[PDB]
Structure 1
Amino acid sequence: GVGISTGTFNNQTEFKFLENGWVEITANSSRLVHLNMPESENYKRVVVNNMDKTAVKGNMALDDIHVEIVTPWSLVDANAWGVWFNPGDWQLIVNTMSELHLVSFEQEIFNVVLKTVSESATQPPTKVYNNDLTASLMVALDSNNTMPFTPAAMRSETLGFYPWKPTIPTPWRYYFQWDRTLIPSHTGTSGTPTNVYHGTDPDDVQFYTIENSVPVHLLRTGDEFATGTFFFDCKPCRLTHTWQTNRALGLPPFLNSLPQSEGATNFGDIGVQQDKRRGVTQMGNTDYITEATIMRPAEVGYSAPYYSFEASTQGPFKTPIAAGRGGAQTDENQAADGDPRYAFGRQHGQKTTTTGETPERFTYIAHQDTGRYPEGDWIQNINFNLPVTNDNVLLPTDPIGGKTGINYTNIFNTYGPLTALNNVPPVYPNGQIWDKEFDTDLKPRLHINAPFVCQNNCPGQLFVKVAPNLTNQYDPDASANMSRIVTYSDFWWKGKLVFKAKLRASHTWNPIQQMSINVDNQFNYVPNNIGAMKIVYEKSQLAPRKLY
């Protein structure tokens, strides 16, 4: 079966308009994947330890020590928006749809090829490449998710984003249990804190092998491998944002006095003394009904401690947060808090011809308003008694623990039974699409890395590896290290991801926000005179939705 193709290249997105404003989006994606034989045909338990860094007082957050099992397999990950949609498809979906549903997923591997490299080491000297017609490509599909879930989008290692650029898979590796202790300190700390890696707890040791837990297929040139169709189990993802705050929920106060002339300084007037008003409040001990005092249904968003690192049995880790935000976009300098930052390279959006090893990055700033402005928070004594007196207020300016740069807001947490919150928004093109749910008895209410989380069923990971091409001399009983003919493989990948979307409706008199090409961004969507390209990030929930 050498001279016969086993598949088709398809990278088209189809919209199929059903009934009742629901369309079916079929995203096809094909790619040529390049794969070299493993640097080692063995599994390894490698420890990483950068104590030299953290040894410097004040650097706890630069902790990198961990342990991982390095396997001789590669992972073919296509779980990122950029792998399926191009800028033009995203604009259509994001501008005209109101919500998204993830439906199916299926892959395929065809037109496999295995070449060999011979050192034509003559003068120059040289190199020769030849087909190894009887060689094999090993393929394993972990349908039962026996293996550790390792989504590549987290480290910018998924398949590439351009239909016409060959891509590659990533070396697979997973974490191995270890104990580590790191006591925090600051520049003025004395003596040496405590920074040790304790080793492994035998009761938490799990060494996984693909050979032992997954059936492997050997594909020769004439072979093809096709995953069946996987049908997802999820909630819909919204493509519209909310802008309401507790301050904009409900019936506003009745203005007994309205302006009578156009004018920036012509305001309306409630026209009633603040302690002589009517309405409901939750401050049982005052007569002041204010817009900051009046009672609202519940609470949109919450407060959490910031740049808080917690520690458990294997080192410090940052305390997660859902969303960030602020008022008049002090943007960028605005950033920080809980706005995701993505760093990527030449294959996932960075300008293709860019030299150097510095990645490209961006901080995604969502349209939703469900965050907090710490500088505006404050706490005061129940007696109320305005104007508040210094000993009766704790402002986000007063120090804590004596530290000049720490407030109570840094320690603060206002999550409770009244917290209303939104799931995470899609991030094009670098964001991950779906995630696997934690196998704990009590699960997170949402995942900070993907808008879709398969509870029960999640697609299995696909592993690939070039089978060993040994030379006439091979001795299993020797330390050496098997020597094998330099072999590599190229195969085509093809996936199909199906969504179900709901067409949007116009509910207000005014137009709304839409994604569009303009004089300014115009050149982020076309190649240059050298064929250089780049894929700029874009927002998903542009279009307000009322919350209450």
Structure 2
Amino acid sequence: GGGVGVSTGSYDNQTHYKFLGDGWVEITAYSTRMVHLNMPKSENYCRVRVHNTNDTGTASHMAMDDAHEQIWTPWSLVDANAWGVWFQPSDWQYISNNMIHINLHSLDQELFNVVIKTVTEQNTGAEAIKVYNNDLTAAMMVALDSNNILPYTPAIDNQETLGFYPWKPTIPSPYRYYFSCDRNLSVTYKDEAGTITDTMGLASGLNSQFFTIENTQRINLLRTGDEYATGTYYFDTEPIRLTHTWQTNRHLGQPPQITELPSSDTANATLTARGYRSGLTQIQGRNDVTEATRVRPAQVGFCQPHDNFETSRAGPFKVPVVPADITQGLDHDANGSLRYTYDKQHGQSWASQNNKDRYTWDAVNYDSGRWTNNCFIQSVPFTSEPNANQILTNRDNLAGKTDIHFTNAFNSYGPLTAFPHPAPIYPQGQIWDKELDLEHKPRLHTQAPFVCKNNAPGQLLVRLAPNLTDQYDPNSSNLSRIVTYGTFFWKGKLTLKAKMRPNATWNPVFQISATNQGTNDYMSIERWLPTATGNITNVPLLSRPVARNTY
């Protein structure tokens, strides 16, 4: 039934595993959080712009332009989409070690045990004590967008998603969305003489969309005895593979046949002379077959233009880059490794004195990466031993500039390209993402493993209904209202399908394992353990431990 003094829900954060048959596992993850909600700092939708001239007013700073236009709303969203919400670290280990692939199934959400209190300040003076007491008749406004009418706004982008710690309360993210505005920002280099345009445009009758929660949604009013339940949402998605691929474009197919087995363990085997070797190559005019020049089924990974900034009406932005292995040469940006910035709630440690903590994720697929300094292009007709003019190296100055090299602007993507789909990032990463409404769609989104084919799971929006004092003028500019805050429990259930991996290999596979403290190894256990004062940290776990045969 429900009422004052009766709990409307239950607190379940534990995770379960059912084995449904051969190799098939149904993973059910319950997660629950206490959520703290403040009266919004304004009652009005607001259209605001940030234009930072201090940064962009002077040359070469283009990359730091923040200028944009957004709609600020009194509403706040509860966003459950990150991996760190749903699983505790060991669960991620257990899944990552034993399962070949995994897929989303369904999502449920509930809100219950709403509590709303009002603040009053008694004994005015040096003491200035605050008094807290329940308003039983106050309500909380709740809205879910099933039809995805509102702009879709993943909270993890800013790391505003619900915290990762079951026993720590968490806060919603205030809901906001971009608004169409035009920006002109000229391109300059350091200490260049000239003037920078650095302007923003007036509103566009064509492009302007202003949405209002109240007009687009059905809002449920929740008092204390009330509870809200989302229906069961079902994902339509492709499963993702949990095993990394080691197998490079030069490891494909049949190896050459050795002449004879080596005599000692230190010796190296020998091959038929490249002049006499049989095989298939696309090089013209030479009689040779070499492991490097032999034809392969397809291109694995591809060179990408990196630190590419392109400018449409909105301004400059960096082109995304498909995450790939940073090779032995370690260069991150060419292969587009991800770099996260996050706070204590999602990570870091309460021991840390820094405002944020930062981590750089490297792709775990050791095949498709590109090591640029060793890439080169050779002139035609092909020749052995090219001279300086017959080969283009990564040391070659492009357009007469020192630090720019063709690998910056070179794009090898083509019909023969094949690359692995990047991997989820356990504590911090976006589980699912909505697909763009464009006709021609990208092969994959960069940050999120899962993309909803038809309709994304809805966004859950909340605000406190305003409490008004005795004196209210509808025409007044300033609004006096009772100081009020509230708390409620958020609960959700996330079902996943996964399948155990086979092992055909003789040798032991690599695994995710804890390690003794006292060595600096990344897996040293204390990082997963509480401190004396209760400080705890949650750090990215490597994913896809087990190798797989690509071909």
TM superposition score normalised by structure 2: 0.96
Q: Distance in 2 between matches of 1:394 and 1:141?
A: 57
Q: State the partner residue of 2:270.
A: 269
Segment drifting more, 49-58 vs 73-82: 49-58
Structure 2 residue runs of 5 or longer lacking an equivalent are 518-523
Q: Distance in 2 between matches of 1:376 and 1:193?
A: 38
Give a deviation string over 1:470-519, Cα, whole Å, max 9, x none. Answer: 0000010222x221100111000000000011011112101111101101
Q: State the partner residue of 2:227.
A: 224
CA contact (8 A) 1:257 1:271 kept: no
Q: State the partner residue of 1:102.
A: 104
SS of equivalent to 1:280: strand
Q: Does 1:136 align with 2:134?
A: no
Give the count of matched residue pairs: 541
Q: State the partner residue of 1:154.
A: 157
CA contact (8 A) 1:366 1:539 kept: no
Segment drifting more, 278-287 vs 78-87: 278-287
The residue identity in structure 1 corresponding to 2:300 is: V
Q: Distance in 2 between matches of 1:128 and 1:269?
A: 86
Segment drifting more, 4-13 vs 114-123: 114-123
Q: State the partner residue of 1:540.
A: 543
CA contact (8 A) 1:435 1:453 kept: yes
Q: Does 1:496 align with 2:476?
A: no
The residue identity in structure 2 corresponding to 1:529 is: A
Q: Distance in 2 between matches of 1:194 and 1:401?
A: 26
Per the alignment, do residues 267 and 497 of structure 1 end up closer, same or farther by CA in structure 2, a change over 3 Å counting? Answer: same
Q: Distance in 1 between matches of 2:156 and 2:220?
A: 26
Q: Distance in 1 between matches of 2:457 and 2:215?
A: 20
Q: 2:118 aligns with which of 116, 119, 130?
A: 116
Q: State the partner residue of 2:204.
A: 201
Question: Aligned runs of 1:11-22 on 2, under 5 Å?
Answer: 11-22=13-24
The residue identity in structure 2 corresponding to 1:175 is: Y
Q: State the partner residue of 1:455.
A: 453
CA contact (8 A) 1:335 1:365 kept: no
Give a deviation string over 1:178-218, Cα, whole Å, max 9, x none. Answer: 11111211114211233221233220100010100000000
Q: Alpha-carbon deviation of 1:335?
A: 6.6
Per the alignment, do residues 381 and 356 of structure 1 end up closer, same or farther by CA in structure 2, a change over 3 Å counting? Answer: closer
CA contact (8 A) 2:396 2:405 kept: yes
Q: 2:35 aligns with which of 33, 36, 52?
A: 33
SS of equivalent to 2:97: helix
Give a deviation string over 1:311-335, Cα, whole Å, max 9, x none. Answer: 101001111111132443x55x757
Q: State the partner residue of 1:523.
A: 526
Q: State the partner residue of 1:363.
A: 360
SS of equivalent to 1:72: strand
Q: State the partner residue of 2:384.
A: 386
Identity score, percent: 52
Q: Does 1:478 align with 2:476?
A: yes
The residue identity in structure 2 corresponding to 1:110 is: F
Q: State the partner residue of 1:285.
A: 285
Q: State the partner residue of 1:305.
A: 305
CA contact (8 A) 2:326 2:362 kept: no
Q: State the partner residue of 1:513.
A: 510
Q: Distance in 2 between matches of 1:180 and 1:268?
A: 63
Q: Distance in 1 between matches of 2:272 and 2:264?
A: 18
Q: Alpha-carbon deviation of 1:310?
A: 0.5
Q: Alpha-carbon deviation of 1:286?
A: 2.1
Q: State the partner residue of 2:190.
A: 187
Q: State the partner residue of 1:442.
A: 440
The residue identity in structure 1 corresponding to 2:299 is: E
The residue identity in structure 2 corresponding to 1:513 is: F
Segment drifting more, 28-37 vs 417-426: 417-426
CA contact (8 A) 2:140 2:222 kept: yes
CA contact (8 A) 2:18 2:25 kept: yes
Say what the alpha-carbon RMSD is for the aligned residues.
1.2
Q: State the partner residue of 1:59.
A: 61
Give a deviation string over 1:376-417, Cα, whole Å, max 9, x none. Answer: 111111111221011111111110111010111100000001
The residue identity in structure 1 corresponding to 2:59 is: K
Q: Distance in 2 between matches of 1:334 and 1:457?
A: 34
The residue identity in structure 2 corresponding to 1:497 is: L
Q: Alpha-carbon deviation of 1:356?
A: 4.2
CA contact (8 A) 1:426 1:539 kept: no
The residue identity in structure 2 corresponding to 1:114 is: I
Q: Does 1:430 align with 2:431?
A: no
Give a deviation string over 1:95-145, Cα, whole Å, max 9, x none. Answer: 111111100001000000100000114331111111000000000000101
SS of equivalent to 2:389: helix
Per the alignment, do residues 440 and 205 of structure 1 end up closer, same or farther by CA in structure 2, a change over 3 Å counting? Answer: same
Q: Alpha-carbon deviation of 1:166?
A: 0.5
Q: State the partner residue of 1:145.
A: 148
Q: 1:175 aligns with which of 178, 201, 208?
A: 178
SS of equivalent to 1:173: strand
Q: State the partner residue of 1:344.
A: 342
Q: Alpha-carbon deviation of 1:161?
A: 0.4
Q: State the partner residue of 2:520.
A: none
Give a deviation string over 1:147-187, Cα, whole Å, max 9, x none. Answer: 11100111111000010001010111000001111121111
Q: Distance in 1 between matches of 2:191 and 2:272?
A: 57
Segment drifting more, 179-188 vs 301-310: 179-188
The residue identity in structure 2 corresponding to 1:2 is: V
Q: Does 1:46 align with 2:43?
A: no
Question: Aligned runs of 1:380-419 on 2, under 5 Å?
Answer: 380-419=378-417
Q: Distance in 1 between matches of 2:342 and 2:417?
A: 34
Q: State the partner residue of 1:85.
A: 87
Structure 1 residue runs of 5 or longer lacking an equivalent are none
Per the alignment, do residues 20 and 120 of structure 1 end up closer, same or farther by CA in structure 2, a change over 3 Å counting? Answer: same
CA contact (8 A) 1:429 1:537 kept: yes
Q: Distance in 2 between matches of 1:208 and 1:227?
A: 22
Give a deviation string over 1:243-302, Cα, whole Å, max 9, x none. Answer: 111100000111114310111xx1111032x23321111123322211111000011111
The residue identity in structure 2 corresponding to 1:142 is: D
CA contact (8 A) 2:116 2:485 kept: yes
The residue identity in structure 1 corresponding to 2:54 is: D
CA contact (8 A) 2:468 2:480 kept: yes
Q: Alpha-carbon deviation of 1:353?
A: 3.6
